[PDB]
Write an enzyme that holds these catalytic residues in place. Structure first.
Site, short mmCIF file in Angstrom:
data_model
loop_
_atom_site.label_atom_id
_atom_site.label_comp_id
_atom_site.label_asym_id
_atom_site.label_seq_id
_atom_site.Cartn_x
_atom_site.Cartn_y
_atom_site.Cartn_z
N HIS A 187 -7.62 -0.77 5.81
CA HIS A 187 -6.49 0.05 6.50
C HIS A 187 -6.36 1.08 5.38
O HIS A 187 -6.36 2.26 6.01
CB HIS A 187 -5.16 -0.74 6.54
CG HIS A 187 -3.88 0.14 7.01
ND1 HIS A 187 -3.79 0.94 8.26
CD2 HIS A 187 -3.02 0.48 6.33
CE1 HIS A 187 -2.80 1.63 7.98
NE2 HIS A 187 -2.19 1.39 6.82
N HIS A 213 0.75 -1.25 -0.03
CA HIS A 213 0.05 -0.08 0.08
C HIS A 213 0.95 1.26 -0.10
O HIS A 213 2.17 1.15 -0.13
CB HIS A 213 -0.93 -0.23 1.26
CG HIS A 213 -0.53 0.35 2.53
ND1 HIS A 213 0.77 -0.18 2.91
CD2 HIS A 213 -1.00 0.93 3.48
CE1 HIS A 213 0.98 0.26 4.21
NE2 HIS A 213 -0.07 1.13 4.55
N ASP A 237 5.81 3.23 5.29
CA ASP A 237 6.29 1.94 5.72
C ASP A 237 6.35 0.71 4.77
O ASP A 237 7.03 -0.28 5.08
CB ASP A 237 5.60 1.37 7.26
CG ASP A 237 4.24 1.02 7.11
OD1 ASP A 237 3.61 1.62 6.23
OD2 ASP A 237 3.72 0.29 7.93
ZN LIG Z 1 -0.37 1.82 6.40
ZN LIG Z 2 1.87 0.06 8.46
#
Ligand SMILES: [Zn+2]
Ligand SMILES: [Zn+2]
Ligand code: NA
Length: 218
Positions: free
Chosen positions: A136, A74, A78
């Site tokens: 998320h 995504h 991170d």
């Molecule tokens: Zn994320």
């Molecule tokens: Zn994450």
């Protein structure tokens, strides 16, 4: 900050753990994978930094592997933090159309190659990419290693709480989790971005946390 960690899970699968201070969260622990096919290595998510990405690449190149590709699960840093450095080394970077759009909209460097396939082989019969739907993030996807029955669920798998809700879709997350449970119930191991590795039940825990997070919001 703790150093980059590289741990062997089994033949051809390694977990990379990188650490970053994030406003509002303190020290975030982030897991990704390196997957070996013969002497080819694939990064599943980059560490937070160019520095950790370079260390990760050097660790595998020094052992006689060639880095053939990296995919980002995504758009958040991170998963995507190393993409600019990888692009500067002409190591191919991949992300969904939606991920590359959300990287642009937020003023970040895009993966070189974008795809719109929901479900396809990154590597035929070895590495599968699957989009279960929003959770998320709108773009979150998972990676499936059929030969080892390992699912990498990224920041979608949240068995202990949903973490950062800023870009989340609470309405869709429960349906997305049910879609993931139906597809990958034969999983021996689920590797999440931010919690300890577990069995297939982490997908159910995420569904439960997603229903609860929806109820608490409404
Ligand atoms: Zn994320
Ligand atoms: Zn994450
Ligand atoms: Na090779």
């Amino acid at each position: 900050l703790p150093d980059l960690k590289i741990e062997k899970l089994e033949e051809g699968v390694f977990v990379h753990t990188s650490f970053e201070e994030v406003n509002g969260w303190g020290v975030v622990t982030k897991h990704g994978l390196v997957v070996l096919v013969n002497t080819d290595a694939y990064l599943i998510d980059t560490p937070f930094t160019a520095t950790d990405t370079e260390k990760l690449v050097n660790w595998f190149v020094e052992r006689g592997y060639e880095i053939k590709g990296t995919i980002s699960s995504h758009f958040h840093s991170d998963s995507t933090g190393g993409i600019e450095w990888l692009n500067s080394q002409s190591i191919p970077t991949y992300a969904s159309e939606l991920t590359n759009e959300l990287l642009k909209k937020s003023g970040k460097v895009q993966a070189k190659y974008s795809f719109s396939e929901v479900s396809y082989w990154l590597v035929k019969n070895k590495i599968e990419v699957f989009y279960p739907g929003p959770g998320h993030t709108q773009d979150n996807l998972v990676v499936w290693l059929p030969e080892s029955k390992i699912l990498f669920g990224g920041c979608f798998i949240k068995p202990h709480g949903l973490g950062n809700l800023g870009d989340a879709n609470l309405e869709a997350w429960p349906k997305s989790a049910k879609i993931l449970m139906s597809k990958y119930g034969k999983a021996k191991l689920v590797v999440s971005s931010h919690s300890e590795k577990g069995d297939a039940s982490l997908m159910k825990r995420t569904w439960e946390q997603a229903l609860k997070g929806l109820k608490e919001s409404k």
